[PDB]
Design a protein around this ligand. Structure first.
Ligand SMILES: [Mn+2]
Ligand SMILES: [Mn+2]
Lengths: 252, 498
């Protein structure tokens, strides 16, 4: 109970590594700051500077390679290529070794740590990238507005489907059997917009319940909500934005 | 005694000049003011706020900016006329104006360019939306007297608490002030606190159009009913307006004398241009307008103002035509009304200099006021009632209403919470309020911090002051937008683009 599958630690470490560097590269593409400004933001946030540290071996290395290269490569292409490679060459072997060194608990699935342990210098290099990304990229207004817009879109969608929840058991169930329910025109059509795969999982789950039990209405409601959360969470950003505008009548 | 050297104050509130100064040096100070205002974003924003008609794709129609440039020309004329009438009576040197002729004109010219500078996006209707939104939240009428058992105020700290307090008095004012947003009151706030423009006292005195505080609740004094018609400054500027009154030798509730000139320029230039645009938008023809004007003046007494001004221009307009009718309608109106206004100014100069004259230059008794009253009546029945105009006014009211609801989270927050949002940039548990807070303009946020920090930390009225300053912050942000930016931000945050 509560044990993890051993390969999960590896995927978790791959997430931890790839979590940030790419977002800085994209930030330079979006002209938010120059590659030169990025190097100094990274130099500043590392603080305790030494000839020999990860910073020196990984990110300072990439900065020097980017200056005076053949292979007619862009400065930014060259900086980030070697920022990616240098980071991998240091952080992958460390993660692999950690996996092997703790293989008994990882195999049992009870190892209460990540591969890039929250202490290590490798985790410090990753924290370095996060610190810059947090203060200079994720704070960009265009990003922050998108976050504001998304929250209103998913919030608003749930209210549009609120009718399906503000219904009794016998009522919602009648809507599941009869396709056309005479007296519930809105809830009917709302029900049919839900993707077929999600309605099927609701019917399947509820049918496996004992019909007569006193907890049946509790289980039905749980599955009804799961039905809606399935429908919403299965959308793309653009589909969900589109449906929001459409069901508030604003597109043609 | 009348001495404009005591009224045309070239000192500043901050990093100020002092000490004698020649005629040339005083001129250069006031010309600095011109450069400060002309280069202000707040003036530039005037070309995308609307004057009556929706912004057309061919700029044929007036905006707040082009209208204000016309008002400036009218004010220039009235000032030039007062000074010339005065030079001929030899009162110029006696009134201390011989070395201030330039500034006297400039201040009026700039005061004209700057009315409507503090006006919110959709004009009369942006003000309406703001005050209505805060009325439902604060309910200032529930604070008029003894604390009320059901205080409908939404804010814990602003509700009248029964335990006989003097704190209830500050609550009373804060609640009233915040529900009387006024463009003129906002203009002073903008030129002083928000845009940090550091104008001369005289220049700021010129746009203090009314002398009533926004927090005023009772009946207005019979002696100052005109000077206190609408609110003139906020609670937030009381200390500044006190510094200003002393510097301009104003009694309490007294107005700066050059303000009357700018006001008359507004009263004159307020309407004729809107009739000209109505003809451009083909609402009615120039011929129809003449007869709508003939009919609404009533009793024709051939020798009347109508015949001298509008009938005259109608006759001239025969032998381009609409250009000709409106050119001579404007000129004829100016040539009768500017001398009337300039004369009224001189004849009532003691009270106007004292700043207490409880009438306009174009008081309702005048035939001249009847000519202006004529233009408004036709404009109301045929222009301002037009569906396209009224619809824009409906839309604008909804847009500003909607914007305020979007920032409600910033207001439905405790003091300890909101402060944490100001100190730390990243607040973990308030991601929406954080992100909403960052959308507020840096200049407005700075004016909130500055004001809050100057308060005594320990006071029991501190949370009341903070909420007031937070509310001003939101109104500063909203009233600063152009019509179009506010319309865009509404759509963006309601999500209709990406
Ligand atoms: Mn990931
Ligand atoms: Mn005006």
């Amino acid at each position: 109970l509560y044990s993890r599958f051993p390969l999960t630690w590896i995927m978790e470490a791959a997430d931890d590594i790839s979590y940030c560097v790419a977002d800085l590269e994209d930030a330079v593409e979006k002209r938010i700051f120059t590659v030169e400004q990025l190097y100094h933001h990274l130099h500043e946030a590392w603080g305790q500077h030494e000839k020999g540290s990860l910073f020196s071996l990984v990110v300072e290395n990439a900065w020097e390679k980017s200056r005076s290269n053949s292979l007619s490569r862009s400065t930014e292409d060259q900086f980030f290529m070697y920022l990616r490679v240098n980071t991998l060459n240091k952080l992958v072997p460390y993660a692999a070794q950690r996996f092997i060194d703790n293989l008994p608990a990882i195999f049992a699935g009870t190892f209460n740590h990540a591969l890039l342990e929250d202490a290590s210098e490798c985790s410090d290099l990753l924290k370095l990238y996060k610190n810059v990304a947090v203060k200079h990229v994720f704070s960009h207004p265009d990003v922050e507005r998108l976050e504001l817009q998304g929250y209103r879109v998913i919030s608003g969608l749930l209210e549009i489907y609120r009718p399906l929840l503000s219904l009794s058991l016998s009522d919602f169930t009648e809507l599941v059997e009869k396709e056309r329910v005479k007296r519930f025109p809105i809830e009917s059509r709302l029900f049919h917009k839900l993707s077929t795969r999600h309605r099927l999982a609701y019917v399947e789950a509820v049918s496996k319940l004992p019909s007569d039990s006193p907890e049946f209405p509790l289980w039905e409601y749980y599955y009804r909500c799961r039905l809606l959360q399935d429908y919403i969470s299965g959308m793309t950003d653009l589909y969900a934005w589109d449906e929001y505008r459409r069901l508030m009548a604003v597109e043609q | 005694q009348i001495d404009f050297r005591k009224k045309i104050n070239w000192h500043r509130r901050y990093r100020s000049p002092q000490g004698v100064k020649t005629e040339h040096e005083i001129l250069r100070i006031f010309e600095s003011d011109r450069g400060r205002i002309i280069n202000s974003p707040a003036i530039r924003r005037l070309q995308q706020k609307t004057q009556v008609f929706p912004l057309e794709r061919n700029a044929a129609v007036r905006t707040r900016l082009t209208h204000s440039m016309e008002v400036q020309q009218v004010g220039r004329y009235i000032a030039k006329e007062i000074l010339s009438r005065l030079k001929e009576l030899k009162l110029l040197e006696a009134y201390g104006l011989d070395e201030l002729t330039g500034p006297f004109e400039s201040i009026v010219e700039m005061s004209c360019l700057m009315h409507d500078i503090g006006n919110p996006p959709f004009g009369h209707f942006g003000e309406a939306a703001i005050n209505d939104w805060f009325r439902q939240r604060l309910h200032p009428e529930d604070a008029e007297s003894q604390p009320l058992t059901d205080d409908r105020c939404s804010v814990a700290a602003l509700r009248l608490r029964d335990g006989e307090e003097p704190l209830n008095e500050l609550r009373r004012k804060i609640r009233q002030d915040l529900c009387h947003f006024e463009g003129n009151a906002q203009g002073i706030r903008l030129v002083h606190t928000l845009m940090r423009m550091n104008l001369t006292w005289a220049q700021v005195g010129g746009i203090l159009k009314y002398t009533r505080p926004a927090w005023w609740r009772g009946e207005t004094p019979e002696t100052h009913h005109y000077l206190m018609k609408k609110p003139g400054y906020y609670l937030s500027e009381e200390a500044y307006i006190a510094r200003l009154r002393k510097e301009l030798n104003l009694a309490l509730y007294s107005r700066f004398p050059l303000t009357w000139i700018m006001e008359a320029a507004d009263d004159i230039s307020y309407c004729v241009a809107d009739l000209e645009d109505a003809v451009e938008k083909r609402i009615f023809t120039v011929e129809q307008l003449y007869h709508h004007l003939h009919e609404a003046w009533g009793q024709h007494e051939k020798g009347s103002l109508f015949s001298l001004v509008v009938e005259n221009a109608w006759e001239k307009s025969r032998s381009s035509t609409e250009d000709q009718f409106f050119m001579y309608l404007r000129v004829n109106t100016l040539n009768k009304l500017v001398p009337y206004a300039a004369q009224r100014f001189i004849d009532n100069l003691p009270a106007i200099f004292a700043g207490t004259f409880n009438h306009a230059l174009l008081e309702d008794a005048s035939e001249c006021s009847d000519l202006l009253k004529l233009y408004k009546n036709v404009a109301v029945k045929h222009v301002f009632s037009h569906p396209d105009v009224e619809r824009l006014e409906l839309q604008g009211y909804r847009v500003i209403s909607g914007l305020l609801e979007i920032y409600r989270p910033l207001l439905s927050l405790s003091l300890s919470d909101f402060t944490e949002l100001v100190e730390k940039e990243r607040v973990k548990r308030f991601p929406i309020e954080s992100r909403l807070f960052h959308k507020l303009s840096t200049r407005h946020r700075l004016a909130y911090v500055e004001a809050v920090s100057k308060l005594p930390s320990d006071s029991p009225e501190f949370p009341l002051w903070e909420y007031y300053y937070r509310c001003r912050l939101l109104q500063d942000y909203i009233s600063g937008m152009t019509d179009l930016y506010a319309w865009d931000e509404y759509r963006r945050l309601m999500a209709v683009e990406q």
